[PDB]
Design a protein around this ligand. Structure first.
Ligand SMILES: [Mg+2]
Ligand SMILES: [Mg+2]
Ligand SMILES: [Mg+2]
Ligand SMILES: [Mg+2]
Ligand SMILES: [Mg+2]
Ligand SMILES: [Mg+2]
Ligand SMILES: [Mg+2]
Ligand SMILES: [Mg+2]
Ligand SMILES: [Mg+2]
Ligand SMILES: [Mg+2]
Ligand SMILES: [Mg+2]
Ligand SMILES: [Mg+2]
Ligand SMILES: [Mg+2]
Ligand SMILES: [Mg+2]
Ligand SMILES: [Mg+2]
Ligand SMILES: [Mg+2]
Ligand SMILES: [Mg+2]
Ligand SMILES: [Mg+2]
Ligand SMILES: [Mg+2]
Ligand SMILES: [Mg+2]
Ligand SMILES: [Mg+2]
Ligand SMILES: [Mg+2]
Ligand SMILES: [Mg+2]
Ligand SMILES: [Mg+2]
Ligand SMILES: [Mg+2]
Lengths: 48, 269, 186, 165, 174, 288, 318
RNA sequence: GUUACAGACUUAAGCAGUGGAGCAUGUUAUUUAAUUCGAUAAUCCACGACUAACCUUACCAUAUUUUGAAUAUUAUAAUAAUUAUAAUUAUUAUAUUACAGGCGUUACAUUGUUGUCUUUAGUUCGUGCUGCAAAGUUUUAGAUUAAGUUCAUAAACGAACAAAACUCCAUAUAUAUAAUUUUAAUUAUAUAUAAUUUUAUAUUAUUUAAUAUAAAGAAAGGAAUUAAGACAAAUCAUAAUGAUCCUUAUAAUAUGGGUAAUAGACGUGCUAUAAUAAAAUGAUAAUAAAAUUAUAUAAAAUAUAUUUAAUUAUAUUUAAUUAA
């Protein structure tokens, strides 16, 4: 496809006035939070 | 004027509805870049008698949008029963189609007669002077790579040639010259643009003509016309050359004109 | 009922008129493709109507044969390959052919058609230019000037009585007029 | 429930909608002009930028818009206004479109080949090869300079290294 | 919706009997009551031959039948040269053979599409239709013979899972 | 039909007059005008298209395909309400339909249709009381199919009382409605001494339940099984003693007790008539 | 005989009597079965266009949900977009739902969103889209006042908004409300009435033709042919689909907190056969050759705590 | 592991096959560093897979990546676009955590979809009525149909999802259009009409229903649609999601290898075992349809295999057309 296509990121750039909500992202964040709460969060990544 | 919303200073003397409309326009046009104005506020206050809202309340609403409205003040009414005041999806689609039809009818009625102003009689270029036919193709909405394709096509007898030179030209053409229909055509897709391709084709044609008219130590009188490609093409296609025998016909057996007396009586003109 | 419905309305209500062909000098043929009929047929009818007024002797929607792009597919996401479903797509094709018109009129027609185009319908145009055998792009500057003059004549505002105007077209005209444009070639 | 405001059709309104490929000379110039405007990123197919919005004057037509290989995301560059806007309008493009001028490359002569290689038969073979290449490259569409470079490489006048840059 | 067949039959019986009353003795009232319950030709051409188009399978046969002495020309060549199988020729003849008019009518057939036997059948079909114009009284006879019926037998398509139209791939139990 | 310019101006606006004139010039007087059967360009009704309609044409300022406006200009900046509402009459109601305690009124209306009963009486004077409110099920091949069973005594509190049962797979409100309907269909005049209690001490068997209902002195209240009490409240019995033996199946009590009232009781007057004797009530004669 | 011939030549009308056609108010254009209404000659380009359209749909869906200072999250439901690709221009369009004269003086979040689509001079969404298509784009929102006029919206709304009413089990009140959306319309009666109206119209036109009549097939003037025929009388009667006759809504998946297994729960109302096609000239037609025109089916699958579930909706529309 | 009737490719005829041979392909088993994973009674076995050289691939060996494909948060710095040498924005770079990612495990957590019962004829709701009631009647005593479609009868009367019908293909007819060089008008394509055919004479059984005969008609098929429930049937390898497990590794890239291994076994096919059947030849080129050709279709012709040349196969080189 055309890699330059409008994304949710841009929907903040174009229309700052409207406080949009990306639903899938929000859901993912909620899931992550739940995982953190119940001791099933991701282990901290090794750097070395 | 059209550019009226942009100047909030001018509109105090307008009616209230008009002022409201201008305000709404202003809000629309500069959505995120909206910045309140004193004159505009004053206008809005003046309008307040139109739609039943107090003077402090209107000002508060202007200052704070939806939050202010909330402060001034609900049940879910999603599955509230049907009051029969709105068409469904299919219905609405059918209506839209009908609107489109009506629009097109209107166009046909009042714009196409106007279009007949821009009307010119045909100015024919004679086949004697203009035998060659450069056909160009154009795909309207798309950007096809066949839009560059141009096709020159000429009857070889229509070209200004002597008989010896004509034969030589035909020989040079090879597969491009058909012999059943005395036609030579060629297309070019080599170049980027259509005009370029047409020019190239023209140049080729000119070169071919120059070669035909040479005759100096190169006649091609004793190379017969190769018609193999044409016969191959004919084989690929089908033929309906056969016809009804002319001696099998029977004009005497044909149905004669039957006498209709009432029709005859009618025809007094 | 004492209400005079003029001729244009009547014409709209009835089938579209067609002007007769004086000479068989096929100037342009326009093929209309679409994945269905109703819109396409309507569009063709509209094209014919506008062609009548622009006096173009258009012939009419000769239906060229429909295509059929078939594709079969196993219904399931996994195995059950004994059950299979077909799919098809019909490219409906209609042909218009303009027969006697001075190029400018034809261009206008085509431009008008593409302006008020319909949803489902694609379009292709084959234009035909009966030129002489020998040609010359040597006497150039004068020919360019003539072309510019012709363009100017074509796109002149006769009476500004709230007529249709285009900003891009005006810009194009301005560019054509300019000294820089004239200079280009030499 | 109101009167139909009939705006009269005009050639000017039907300008832009003129076919991109039409035989006429007059039409060709117009088409070229339209193409030049499009290249410049003039507001065709879109509402113009004027001195009303100041911050949000964005465009998507950057040097490599719908392309992958240049590493970036969507770049919202600010558009000029209708004033302070330049038009590209290059001569080579005009020559290509309005007139039907084409380059055709140059056939490599035998003398040039003799400059490098010694033997006659080998030179003749090289010349033949160059000729063969030329017609193929004319047929293909690539780019004025790039195509020429390729042709040179094929001939042996330039080495293979000049391609990989 | 509450009307039954038996009721309708009864009603018909009632009406019919009333109608049957000798027209001379009938009344105005009866007739008023009963009032409620009421409710292109082919020809030869300029040259005197009957064109007719017949079809079978993929074949199409436009056939010019004319009154001259009985000779055949299929598709611009002799009949024995075109149709090699005698069966096809016999089939073609059959419309002229059900009538006693083989030898009477010159026939100029022009076929397209399909194979030879199907083409011959389409020609035959066309000829019967052509003959029907020359004498309309024989039309019923031709129909009875089975020549005026367009043979519908159409090649069934290959269905998805099946190999051919009906031929399925082998079944297994174990 | 080629009309004059002045006539056209009288009926048509000044903008389209030129276009009309042009059409007249172009199209000759001798014109055939064929009827296109295979495609219909124009609508199925006559309309001079000079007037743009609100509903049946596109809204002018609104954006769409065939806009014929600039990308900037679209006069439509409020999207709270609907843009193109329905023309002429606001509704699209079919023939014989209307727009939207109430349940009791609906019941009464339905009864009035079905069986000619007075709706107003049903609404006001009758008062209902659910006695049993089961959920009940059937083992079908699909599965266990539950069904809400109600049993609802209704009664004007002047000796007019009726029991009714009803059933719905859908929720219990519907079942109760049905039970109420049934009760009003089955209204029944019970006899009662002094408009407060039964005549004699009755002892009646309905299926399982063995009933025993003693009469009562005035002031002594209802002292009986809860179902019986409920039925008495509706049927206007103020004073009653009694006790249920054997089965105490609520439904069968409810059915049995109304049967006992209607059947086991004999009014004094009826007894007197049968026997041919005076049958005085001593207390009444005394004047308490 | 001449008069009869003339009538035969001109004998056309709206379909639906027992020389007739299905008018543009009597059936759907088969183009309105597909969502990318396009033909291009280069099929690669067409594919690219339809991809773009699909990507824009997702973007639009994303936009549709707003927030108000983390107080209220008004989820505007939108239909699947339909993209009309004329030669000149694209036009995107969708149907949407949103849940005293005090609000003349502030712009609502939904209003702002709608304004963004086409009204923001340079900044608007249509302008930005135009770069992807190389033609002028026009987004038209269409407001629906009810949830159940469009099938997609109905299914989508239930998936997103009314979670709590069915997550453990379908609450009784909610179920009742679903059941009694429409007032149980006698669909047989309505179809029959419509047919009668069509017949009457046909008779009227025929009568007019007769009156006019008292080798060329031209009748009288237009005014006299269409004597009683007007915009006020005909169009709305002829309009085919108007009445949600019957509808079915199915909830399916893990919609039970106690139970591990799934739960198919179906609500059924009215009827899904159409009686206008049963006894008249108008015939039924099939969208994508498998969905009766009058039907419109859709589903939308929101994720729960327990896992995935969906909500089929299916309406009939006489 | 039950009665009784009715049904059809069920059986019976019949035609051609499988089962023997060799090969192809899938499966099994075993092998292997890896032979990736699933499908595996009917309802797996040229199935998922409409093409496994690399890639695709998921498997294996050896190498090497570690915020990685995203979104957001917090900072430094650099370039470009816009404005009237500063600033606003957009991006990029380096980092910074939450994480990203997972064809890992469970279709006995799910979605959607599909298979089989199934184009089978079943599956239920209002009002009335029966039963104390759960329930029953309707939804069947007969009969008939392909059929819960229908007439006879019946405490029933109507109404829905199925059935039928509308739908598509094909057919016949009519109208329109096609300057009969994009022609095939013997066509193509829009719009109609047409039949689940009708009528009458007789012969059997009771006004009708089957047979026969006749006269009227072009009138004779195929496709899609496969309900409810069930099989914890198939799919987490289309995709998505719940729970759970991996986070310098169960995530990511390259080079090669493997998926093509071979004792026996099992399906599907292909080619065969010669004269009611195989091979040479057949240019005024015997007779088709359907479909593809801008990520192309490749004509004629020259050259070699080949002393004539044709055939067949390559090469040489692209004529024509992006297409009635
Ligand atoms: Mg009872
Ligand atoms: Mg058998
Ligand atoms: Mg064996
Ligand atoms: Mg074997
Ligand atoms: Mg697995
Ligand atoms: Mg395996
Ligand atoms: Mg590998
Ligand atoms: Mg994860
Ligand atoms: Mg992996
Ligand atoms: Mg599943
Ligand atoms: Mg599994
Ligand atoms: Mg039952
Ligand atoms: Mg049953
Ligand atoms: Mg069916
Ligand atoms: Mg022809
Ligand atoms: Mg089922
Ligand atoms: Mg299982
Ligand atoms: Mg399962
Ligand atoms: Mg999973
Ligand atoms: Mg996955
Ligand atoms: Mg990895
Ligand atoms: Mg394998
Ligand atoms: Mg198989
Ligand atoms: Mg043999
Ligand atoms: Mg060849």
């Amino acid at each position: 496809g055309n890699p330059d296509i409008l994304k949710f990121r841009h929907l903040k750039t174009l229309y700052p006035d409207i406080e949009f909500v990306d639903l899938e992202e929000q859901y993912r964040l909620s899931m992550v939070e739940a995982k953190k709460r119940r001791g099933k969060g991701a282990p901290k990544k090794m750097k070395k | 004027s059209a550019d009226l919303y942009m100047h909030p200073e001018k509109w105090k003397g307008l009616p209230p509805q008009r002022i409201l409309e201008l305000y709404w326009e202003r809000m629309a046009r500069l959505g995120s870049e909206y910045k309140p104005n004193k004159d505009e506020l004053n206008a809005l206050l003046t309008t307040s008698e139109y739609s039943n809202v107090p003077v402090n309340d209107i000002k508060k609403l202007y200052h704070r949008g939806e939050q202010g409205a909330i402060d001034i003040k609900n049940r879910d009414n999603s599955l509230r029963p049907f009051m029969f005041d709105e068409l469904p999806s299919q219905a609405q689609e059918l209506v839209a189609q009908h609107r489109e039809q009506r629009f097109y009818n209107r166009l046909a009625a009042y714009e196409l007669p106007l279009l007949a102003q821009y009307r010119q009689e045909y100015k024919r270029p004679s086949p004697e002077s203009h035998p060659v036919t450069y056909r160009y193709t154009s795909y309207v909405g798309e950007e096809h790579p066949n839009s560059r394709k141009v096709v020159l096509s000429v009857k070889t007898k229509e070209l200004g040639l002597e008989e010896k030179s004509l034969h030589k030209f035909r020989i040079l053409a090879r597969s491009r010259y058909d012999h059943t229909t005395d036609i030579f055509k060629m297309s070019s897709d080599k170049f980027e643009h259509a005009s370029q391709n047409a020019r190239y084709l023209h140049d080729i044609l000119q070169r071919l003509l120059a070669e035909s008219k040479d005759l100096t130590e190169d006649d091609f009188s004793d190379v017969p016309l190769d018609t193999r490609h044409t016969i191959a093409k004919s084989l690929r296609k089908k033929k309906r050359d056969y016809e009804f025998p002319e001696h099998w016909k029977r004009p005497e057996d044909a149905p004669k004109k039957k006498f209709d007396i009432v029709d005859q009586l009618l025809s007094t003109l | 009922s004492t209400r005079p419905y003029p001729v244009n309305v009547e014409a709209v209500y009835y089938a579209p008129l067609k002007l007769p062909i004086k000479y068989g000098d096929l100037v342009a043929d326009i093929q209309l493709r679409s994945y269905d009929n109703e819109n396409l047929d309507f569009y063709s009818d509209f094209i014919l109507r506008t062609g009548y007024y622009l006096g173009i002797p258009l012939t009419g929607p000769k239906p060229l044969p429909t295509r059929r792009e078939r594709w079969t597919v196993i219904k399931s996401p996994f195995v059950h390959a004994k059950s299979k479903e077909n799919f098809e797509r019909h490219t409906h094709k209609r042909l218009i052919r303009a027969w006697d018109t001075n190029p400018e009129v034809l261009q206008m027609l085509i431009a008008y058609i593409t302006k008020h185009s319909m949803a489902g319908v694609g379009m292709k145009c084959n234009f035909f230019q009966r030129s002489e055998i020998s040609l010359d792009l040597g006497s150039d500057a004068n020919g360019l000037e003539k072309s510019l003059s012709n363009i100017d004549e074509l796109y002149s505002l006769r009476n500004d009585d709230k007529a249709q105007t285009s900003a891009v077209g005006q810009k194009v005209l301005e560019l054509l007029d300019s000294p820089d444009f004239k200079k280009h070639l030499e | 429930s109101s009167e139909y405001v009939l705006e009269e059709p005009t050639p000017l309104s039907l300008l832009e909608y003129t076919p991109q490929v039409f035989p006429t000379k007059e039409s060709r110039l117009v088409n070229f002009t339209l193409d030049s405007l499009k290249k410049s990123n003039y507001p065709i197919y879109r509402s113009p930028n004027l001195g009303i919005l100041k911050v949000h004057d964005f465009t998507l037509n950057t040097p490599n818009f719908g392309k992958y290989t240049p590493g970036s995301s969507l770049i919202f560059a600010k558009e000029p206004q209708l004033q302070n806007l330049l038009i590209e309008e290059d001569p080579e493009d005009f020559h290509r479109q309005v007139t039907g001028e084409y380059q055709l490359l140059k056939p490599y002569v035998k003398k040039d080949f003799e400059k490098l290689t010694k033997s006659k038969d080998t030179v003749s073979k090289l010349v033949q090869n160059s000729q063969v290449v030329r017609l193929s490259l004319q047929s293909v569409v690539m780019g004025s300079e790039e195509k020429k470079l390729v042709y040179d490489v094929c001939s042996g006048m330039k080495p293979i290294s000049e391609l990989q840059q | 919706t509450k009307l039954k067949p038996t009721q309708y039959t009864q009603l018909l019986y009632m009406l019919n009997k009333l109608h049957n009353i000798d027209p001379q003795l009938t009344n105005d009232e009866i007739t008023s009551e009963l009032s409620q319950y009421y409710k292109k030709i082919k020809t030869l051409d300029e040259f005197g031959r009957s064109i007719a188009v017949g079809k079978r399978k993929s074949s199409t046969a436009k056939v010019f039948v004319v009154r001259g002495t009985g000779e055949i020309l299929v598709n611009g060549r002799q009949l024995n040269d075109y149709f090699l199988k005698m069966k096809d020729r016999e089939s073609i003849m059959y419309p002229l053979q059900v009538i006693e008019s083989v030898g009477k009518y010159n026939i100029f057939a022009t076929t397209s599409g399909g194979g030879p036997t199907g083409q011959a059948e389409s020609i035959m079909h066309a000829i019967a239709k052509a003959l029907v114009v020359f004498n309309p009284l024989l039309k019923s006879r031709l129909h009875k013979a089975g020549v005026l019926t367009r043979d519908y037998r159409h090649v069934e398509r290959k269905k998805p899972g099946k190999k051919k139209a009906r031929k399925m791939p082998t079944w297994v139990k174990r | 039909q080629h009309y004059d310019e002045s006539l056209l101006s009288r009926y048509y606006p000044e903008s389209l007059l030129k276009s009309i004139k042009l059409a007249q010039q172009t199209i000759p007087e001798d014109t055939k005008f064929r009827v296109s059967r295979n495609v219909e360009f124009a609508p199925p009704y006559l309309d001079d298209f000079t007037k743009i309609h609100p509903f049946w044409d596109y809204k002018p300022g609104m954006p769409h395909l065939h806009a014929q406006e600039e990308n900037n200009n679209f006069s439509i900046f409020r999207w709270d309400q609907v843009q193109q509402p329905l023309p002429g009459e606001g509704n699209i109601l079919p023939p014989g339909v209307s727009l939207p305690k109430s349940k009791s009124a609906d019941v009464a209306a339905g009864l009035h249709k079905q069986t000619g009963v007075d709706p107003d009486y049903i609404t006001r004077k009758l008062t209902m009381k659910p006695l049993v409110m089961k959920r009940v099920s059937n083992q079908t091949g699909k599965g266990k199919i539950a069904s809400f069973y109600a049993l609802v005594v209704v009664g004007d509190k002047n000796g007019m009382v009726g029991l009714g049962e009803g059933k719905s797979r859908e929720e219990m409100s519907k079942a109760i409605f049905k039970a109420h309907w049934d009760a009003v269909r089955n209204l029944k005049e019970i006899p009662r001494y002094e408009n407060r209690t039964i005549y004699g001490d009755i002892d009646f068997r309905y299926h399982g339940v063995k009933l025993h209902l003693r009469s009562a002195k005035p002031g002594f209240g209802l002292r009986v099984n809860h179902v019986i009490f409920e039925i008495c409240e509706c049927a206007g019995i103020k004073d009653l003693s009694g006790k249920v033996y054997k089965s105490r199946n609520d439904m069968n009590i409810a059915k049995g007790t109304i049967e006992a009232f209607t059947k086991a009781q004999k009014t004094l007057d009826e007894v007197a008539l049968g026997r041919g004797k005076k049958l005085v009530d001593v207390r009444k004669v005394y004047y308490s | 005989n001449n008069m009869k011939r003339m009538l035969n030549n001109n004998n056309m009308n709206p379909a639906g009597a027992n020389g007739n056609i299905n008018n543009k108010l009597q059936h759907l254009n088969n183009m309105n079965n597909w969502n990318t209404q396009i033909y291009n000659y280069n099929k690669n380009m067409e594919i690219m266009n339809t991809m773009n359209d699909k990507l824009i749909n997702k973007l639009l869906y994303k936009m549709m949900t707003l927030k108000l200072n983390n107080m209220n999250i008004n989820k505007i439901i939108m239909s699947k977009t339909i993209n009309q690709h004329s030669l000149n221009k694209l036009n995107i369009k969708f149907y949407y739902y949103n849940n005293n004269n005090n609000n003349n003086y502030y712009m609502n979040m939904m209003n702002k969103l709608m304004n963004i689509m086409n009204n923001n001079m340079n900044n608007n969404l249509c302008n930005i889209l135009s770069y992807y298509y190389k033609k002028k784009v026009t987004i038209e929102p269409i407001k629906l006042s009810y949830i159940y006029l469009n099938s997609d919206i109905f299914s989508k709304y239930i998936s997103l908004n009314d979670m709590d009413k069915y997550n453990n089990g379908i609450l009784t009140n909610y179920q009742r409300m679903l059941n009694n959306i429409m007032p149980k319309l006698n669909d047989h009666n309505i179809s029959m009435n419509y047919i009668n109206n069509i017949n009457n119209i046909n008779n009227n036109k025929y009568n007019n033709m007769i009156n006019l009549l008292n080798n060329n097939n031209y009748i009288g003037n237009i005014n006299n042919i269409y004597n009683n025929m007007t915009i006020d009388n005909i169009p709305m009667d002829i309009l085919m689909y108007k009445y949600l006759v019957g509808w079915s809504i199915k909830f399916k998946g893990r919609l039970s907190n106690n139970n591990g297994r799934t739960s198919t729960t179906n609500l059924l109302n009215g009827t899904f056969n159409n009686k206008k096609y049963l006894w008249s000239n108008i015939n039924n037609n099939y969208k994508l050759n498998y969905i009766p025109s009058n039907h419109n089916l859709y589903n939308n699958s929101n994720i729960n705590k327990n896992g995935k579930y969906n909500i089929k909706v299916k309406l009939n529309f006489i």
